[PDB]
């Protein structure tokens, strides 16, 4: 059977590592954190069963493979309460894709929009403080708004999976996870709260596993009086995709400070 922790690249074929999906295989429950971009060819066939898929948030790059995953596995999706309708109705999906396209531009087509709504009985709303016994490991959800009103983080023992609430990290460079539009005050509060949890390792949705110290570097980055300007040493299409995303995030950061 499946055991241990699996960190799987779930980005588009042009940049598989831009997004990471985590799977924690406990003795009693198997849980997945996030679900990749719609256009990802990530293969999760190494799983015999899947009990829960926790969505850190509802941005399109974290919920892409749900349609297929919910047909192959008997998994239930856990989402912040009040947002289930965005996944279970045509009008809900239309709004998710609408906001995604407006914010992402060309990246919308790279990652891929949502095309199929999910069955309501497969989606469970949670408050963001629920605890689960995975069997040999303990999981606890944590509501972490700021990046989005529907953002939640996940703590498995001393591993903290932060989604897009505590930064991104590529090639040794800290990138702000601040696309339009973030709630600056809430974002800062959630970031401080997570730093205070003192996890041993952090799992970024964008950048994979990183040291907890990176969260503190991101906090400092958020407090800079000078305009944040980032440059990442990466080439090819992957480099261009990342640069576009960075521009979106820097725009969001600039605008959040004016609020
Ligand atoms: Zn996001
Ligand atoms: Zn994201």
Binding residues for Zn(2+): 57, 59, 61-62, 147, 164, 206
Alpha carbons 10 and 19: distance in angstroms, whole number: 5
The count of residues in the chain is 259
CA of residue 135 to ligand 2 center, whole Å: 29
Give the closest ligand to the alpha carbon of residue 100: 1
Q: How many CA atoms lie within 13 A of 149 on its CB side?
A: 5
Ligand nearest to the CA of 61: 2
Angstrom resolution of this structure: 1.8
**Helix (H) or strand (E) segment spanning residue 93:** helix 90-104
Per 3-state DSSP, what percentage of the chain is helix, strand, and coil (rounded to 5)?
35, 25, 45
* Ligand 2 centroid from CA 19, angstroms: 7
**Domain 1-259 carries which CATH code?**
3.60.15.10
Contact predicate 206/20, CB 8 Å:
yes
Q: Across-strand partners of 203?
A: 161, 209
The domain limits of the chain are 1-259
**Are the beta carbons of 131 and 29 closer than 8 angstroms?**
no
Q: How far apart are CA 175 and CA 171, in angstroms?
A: 10
């Amino acid at each position: 059977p499946c055991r241990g922790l699996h960190s799987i690249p779930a980005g588009p074929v042009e940049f598989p590592e831009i997004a990471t999906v985590y799977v924690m295989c406990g003795e009693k429950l198997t849980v997945m954190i996030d679900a990749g971009v719609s256009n990802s060819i990530a293969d999760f066939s190494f799983l015999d069963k899947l009990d829960y898929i926790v969505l850190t948030h509802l941005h399109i790059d974290h919920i892409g493979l749900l349609p297929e995953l919910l047909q192959v596995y008997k998994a239930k999706v856990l989402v912040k309460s009040g947002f289930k309708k965005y996944l279970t109705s045509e009008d809900g999906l239309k709004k998710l894709n609408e906001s995604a396209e407006k914010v992402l531009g060309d990246l919308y087509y790279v990652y891929g929009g949502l095309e199929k709504k999910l069955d309501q009985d497969k989606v469970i709303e949670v408050e963001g403080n629920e605890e689960f016994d995975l069997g040999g490991y303990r999981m606890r959800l944590i509501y972490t708004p700021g990046h989005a009103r529907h953002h939640m983080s996940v703590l498995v023992d001393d591993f903290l999976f932060t989604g897009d609430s505590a930064g991104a990290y590529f090639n040794g460079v800290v990138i702000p996870t601040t696309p339009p539009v973030i709630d600056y005050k809430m974002y800062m509060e959630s970031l401080k709260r997570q730093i205070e949890l003192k996890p041993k390792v952090v799992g970024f949705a964008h950048g994979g596993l990183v040291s907890p110290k990176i969260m503190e570097e991101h906090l400092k980055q958020m407090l800079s009086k000078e305009e944040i300007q980032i440059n990442v040493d990466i080439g090819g299409v992957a480099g261009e995709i990342l640069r576009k995303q960075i521009e979106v995030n820097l725009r969001g950061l600039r605008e959040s400070k004016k609020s």
